[PDB]
Every structure is written in structure tokens, then in C-alpha cells.
């Protein structure tokens, strides 16, 4: 309910969610695929926290909650289907396109050129492209709880 509280959550996500780009390479994973669409949910919720971060007090822009609520939920819907697409994959082994990027700094944060659901074996402790459902539940569940 203060600059610190908001900045912690904005930091924790910018940090926790940016780490996403780390290890990607040695993992022998690389392809975000649908994930780029989902990466968006991070700046959606982080956007709100970092924009509302101005101070969760004097500034009435509290709207930060709804946009935080929206992006946290929007993240769950897109991540959930992604989880389902593994514990339940579809008949279209083929990939989409067979039936707003670019930016002065670097396109890196987003990418899709590589391949489809193929070898992907992860083997890292307990996967990770699905742990994200719980993590977004946390932001959403923090968000619902503060505005109930």
C-alpha cells in the first residue's frame, strides 16, 4: 500500500519475469512460440505496477489495480491453453499459418522463429513452461485479494 510495496511487486516481476530470457540458451530450448503472446501478460501486469508504482497513495490512478487484474487474468487464459496443449495436445501437429513487433531498441524480448512442439524434453526439475500458471495465479490471487 506504498511506493515500496508496489515497487517490490513491479521489481519482483520485472526480475522474475525477465529471468525468462536467461539460461534459455544452455537449456537447448530457444523457441518462445505462443509464449511471445504470453510474454505480453508480464508487461501488462508489470506495466500496471510499474506505472501505478508512481505511488499507491497521493496518486488516485489506483486504476492500476484493474489493468493489473486484467493482465494477470489475461495471462492465465493464454497460459492455461498452453498447459492444456501439453497434457492434451491437438491433432494439428502442423503449426499455425498452414490451413506488433519491431522496436527502436531490440526485438529480443519477443521471438518465434525456430520450430514447433517437437523434442522439447526440458528435464529441469519440474518443467517450467507451466509453473507460470501458478505464478500468474499469485499476482491475480494477490490482485483479487486486495480489491476482493
Amino acid at each position: 500500500q506504498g511506493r515500496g510495496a508496489w515497487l517490490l511487486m513491479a521489481f519482483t516481476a520485472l526480475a522474475l519475469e525477465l529471468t525468462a530470457l536467461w539460461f534459455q540458451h544452455v537449456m537447448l530450448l530457444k523457441p518462445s512460440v505462443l509464449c511471445i503472446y504470453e510474454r505480453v501478460a508480464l508487461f501488462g501486469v508489470l506495466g500496471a505496477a510499474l506505472i501505478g508504482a508512481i505511488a499507491p497513495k497521493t496518486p488516485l490512478r489506483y486504476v492500476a489495480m484493474v489493468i493489473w487484474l486484467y493482465s494477470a487474468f489475461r495471462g492465465v487464459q493464454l497460459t492455461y491453453e498452453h498447459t492444456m496443449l501439453q497434457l492434451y495436445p491437438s491433432p494439428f501437429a502442423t503449426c499455425d499459418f498452414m490451413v506488433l513487433p519491431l522496436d527502436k531498441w531490440v526485438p529480443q524480448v519477443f521471438v518465434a522463429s525456430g520450430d514447433c512442439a517437437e523434442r522439447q524434453w526440458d528435464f529441469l526439475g519440474l518443467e517450467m513452461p507451466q509453473w507460470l500458471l501458478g505464478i500468474f495465479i499469485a499476482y491475480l490471487i494477490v490482485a483479487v485479494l486486495v480489491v476482493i
Partner: antibody
Amino acid sequence: EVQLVESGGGLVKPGGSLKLSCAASGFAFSSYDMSWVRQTPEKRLEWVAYISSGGGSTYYPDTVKGRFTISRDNAKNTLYLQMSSLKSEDTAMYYCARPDAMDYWGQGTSVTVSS
Amino acid sequence: DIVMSQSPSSLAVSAGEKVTMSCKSSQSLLNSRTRKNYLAWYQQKPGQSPKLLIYWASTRESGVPDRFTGSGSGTDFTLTISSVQAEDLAVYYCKQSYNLYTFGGGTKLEIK
């Protein structure tokens, strides 16, 4: 408990057209996906179309892709198959199925193509 | 596409026996992630819509008597019906759902 009754189709001429509707009744319609299976006169079984839960994506075998159109309307709980440029190959019985693996099948509308 | 092909066309059996017809697919049906064999068996009674019988390859469906069993893995599936009741007159169809939907030709289990 859960029902499907497709209907609305008999004879149609080559190059012809005709639209069938599966009247769905007794399950959370807008939540499942829907499919359209036909069965040839040889008793053969071809899958024909697939629409996603929220009408979003559709899919077809190349053998009807272009000529066939799997719409739905969860307002009036109906599934639809809109057949166009009708080949006399299309001549078959037409089941409307439910997946989660077709677990509740209809009963068929026979459709024949002839002159 | 994938081609499903069952043998034989027909089976006779005296009411109460074990029968194991076979479904073979042109393409392996295994995922790397989970042994998940993406084949189904549908039974279809004379002049009836097919009924779901076994999915994934092993797992039976709500109200399937234990007697129908699904073995198989890779390109090689087998359906097995012990204690053939009279109300088991049918053609048994295998379907792949690994890449689009294809069906076998069918196996007619006619009674003695």
C-alpha cells in the same frame, strides 16, 4: 442426459449445395468442440470438419477443404455443416460428434449426390 | 496422412470367448512427452452411430466392461474382448488422433 440430433439433408445434384444442423441438447455446449463425421456407402469412416469451442478455429481434411464450412451458434445450440460444390463422393451418412475422442455421436442425416 | 489398417475383415466366435483383433498404423502414435498413444477404438453396432470404447490406447471409457481391453504401442494396437456376449455384434474401428483423424477399415465380429 446428453443428446445430438443432426438433420436437414436428402438428395442434391452434383456441384450442388445444402446445409445440415446438429441440434445439440443436454451438455454445456459452448465449452466443448464439435466435429462432423460422415460414413460412406462402403461403410468407410471419414472425418470431415472440426470447429473449436468458441468458433475460433476450424479444420478440414483436404478432401473437403474449400467446399465445406463448420459453423456453430451457441445461441441456438446448433452446430452447422454448410456443404457446397457437391461431389458424388460426398454421398454418405453424416454424424455430428463430440470430443474432449468422439464420445457422444449423433444418428446421422443421410446425404446422397446423384442426378 | 496416417493409414490405419485392421486385420481381419471378419471374426466368428461362440458366445463367451476371447477375441483379439489388431489395428496397425502407418505412423508411430507415441509422443515423446508422456507415453500417450493417441489411438482410439470405436465399436459400431448394426445400423448405429459408433460408440467410444477405449481412448489413448489402454484406457476404457465410462461404462466399458473390463472385458474390452486395449493393448498396443507405437504402430501396433490390439483390441481384446473376453466373454463375448451376444450384444457384441459389431464392427470395431480404430482411429488415430495423432495427426488429424483417420480410421481403420473395420473388423466385423459376427457371432456363432
